[PDB]
Design a binder for this molecule. Structure first.
Ligand SMILES: O=C(NC[C@H](O)c1ccc([N+](=O)[O-])cc1)c1ccc2c(c1)OCO2
Ligand SMILES: O=C(NC[C@H](O)c1ccc([N+](=O)[O-])cc1)c1ccc2c(c1)OCO2
Lengths: 193, 193
C-alpha cells in the first residue's frame, strides 16, 4: 500500500491545482517517487487513480452516515436531519478536488457513473426509511411517496453542495448551504397540505 | 436561415441517436443537404451548432416564463408555482437530446457554461422576487434569505428534471417529477418554524 498511498496522495494534491486531463502519469509517478512503469504496476491508468480516490471519499461518507444511524443522537427532528446532511457537507467539503473531478468523470467513465449511482441509491433508500419511520410514529404527514421525495431531496443536496464547493455562479454560499438544505428538508418532510 | 435551419434540425435529430462526439461535421452537412465547406460558412464547428440549439431552447423557456409573468393566472399559490415549473418541464422535456448534450457540454465549453449560468441567475432572481412579494403580501413567512432559498430550489429542479429526462438511476419518474418539485417548493416557501 505504501507506494499506492503515495500515488493516491499525489493525485489528490495535484487535483487541487488542475484537472485530471492536465495531470500525466509521469506527474503522478514523479510525485510518488517511482518510475512510470512502476506506476502501471499499482494502477492501470490515471483514471483508475481517481476512481479509487472517489471510492474512498464516498465510503467514508457512507460509513460516517452508518455511524450516525447506529447512534440516535438524542435530539429534535430538525437537528437529526442537520446532523446527517452535515456528514456529507464535511466529508465532501474536506475533499473538494476529488469530489469536483469525480463528478466531471461521470461523463467519461461508466465505473465512476455506477459508483456514484450505487451510493445515491443507498442514501436515498435510507432517507426514505427514515421518512417512513417519521410517518409511522405520526410526526410526518403522509404526503408524497417517501421514495420520490427522498430522491429529489438527495439530488438537490448533490447539486447544491457541489455548486457551493466549486464556487459556481450561481451557488449558495458555502457558509449558508447547510441551513438552506436543512430548511427545505424539514419543511418538505413535515409540511402538510 | 434555410440551410442554417436544416443544419440545426439535422443536429437535433442526430442528437436523439448519439452524442456530439459520435456525430461529425460531414454527418451534419450530409443531413442538411450541403457540402462540408458550405457547413463551415454557417457555423465554425459542431460545438457551435449545439450552442445555438441550446441557446434557442433556453430562450424559449425564458420567454414562456416571461409570458406567464405578464399574466397572473387567476389561481391559488400552489398552482402558480406549478404553472411556472411546468414551463421548464414541457420546454426541456420537448428537447431532451439538446438538453442532455447541452448539460454535458458545460464541462468542455465556456460559452455553454456561461449561457446556462446567465439564465439560471435570471430564473433564480425571478424566483426570489416572487418569494419576496409573497412575503410582503403576508402569505409566506420570513424564513431563509429569499435568494438563497431560490438558488437551491432552482438547482434542485435543474438536477431533478435532467435526471428524470435522461432516465438516470436514481431519478423521479418523469410522470411524478412535477408533483414532487411543486410539493417541495410550496412547503419550503410557505412553511414556518
Ligand atoms: O445529503 C446527502 N445525503 C443525505 C442523506 O441522504 C441523509 C441525510 C440525513 C439523514 N438523516 O438525518 O436521517 C439521512 C440521510 C447527499 C447526497 C449526495 C451528495 C451530497 C449529499 O453531497 C454531494 O453528493
Ligand atoms: O424550474 C426551474 N425554474 C423555475 C423558475 O425559476 C420558476 C418557477 C416558478 C415560478 N413561479 O411560478 O412564480 C418562478 C420561477 C428550473 C430551472 C432550471 C432548469 C430547470 C428548471 O429544468 C432544467 O434546468
Amino acid at each position: 500500500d505504501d507506494r499506492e498511498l503515495a500515488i493516491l496522495a499525489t493525485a489528490e494534491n495535484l487535483l487541487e491545482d488542475r484537472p485530471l486531463a492536465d495531470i500525466s502519469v509521469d506527474d503522478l509517478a514523479k510525485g510518488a517517487g517511482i518510475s512510470r512503469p512502476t506506476f502501471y504496476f499499482y494502477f492501470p491508468s490515471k483514471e483508475a487513480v481517481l476512481l479509487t480516490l472517489l471510492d474512498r471519499v464516498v465510503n467514508q461518507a457512507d460509513m460516517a452516515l452508518q455511524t450516525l444511524a447506529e447512534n440516535p443522537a438524542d435530539t429534535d427532528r430538525e437537528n437529526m436531519w442537520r446532523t446527517g446532511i452535515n456528514v456529507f457537507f464535511e466529508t465532501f467539503g474536506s475533499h473538494k478536488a476529488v469530489t469536483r473531478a469525480g463528478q466531471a468523470a461521470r461523463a467519461t467513465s461508466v465505473e465512476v457513473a455506477e459508483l456514484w449511482s450505487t451510493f445515491m441509491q443507498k442514501w436515498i433508500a435510507y432517507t426514505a426509511a427514515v421518512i417512513d419511520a417519521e410517518r409511522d410514529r405520526g410526526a410526518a404527514p403522509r404526503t408524497l411517496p417517501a421514495h420520490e421525495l427522498a430522491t429529489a431531496l438527495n439530488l438537490m443536496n448533490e447539486r447544491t453542495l457541489f455548486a457551493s464547493f466549486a464556487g459556481e455562479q450561481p451557488s449558495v454560499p458555502e457558509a449558508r448551504v447547510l441551513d438552506t438544505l436543512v430548511h427545505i428538508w424539514v419543511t418538505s418532510i413535515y409540511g402538510e397540505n
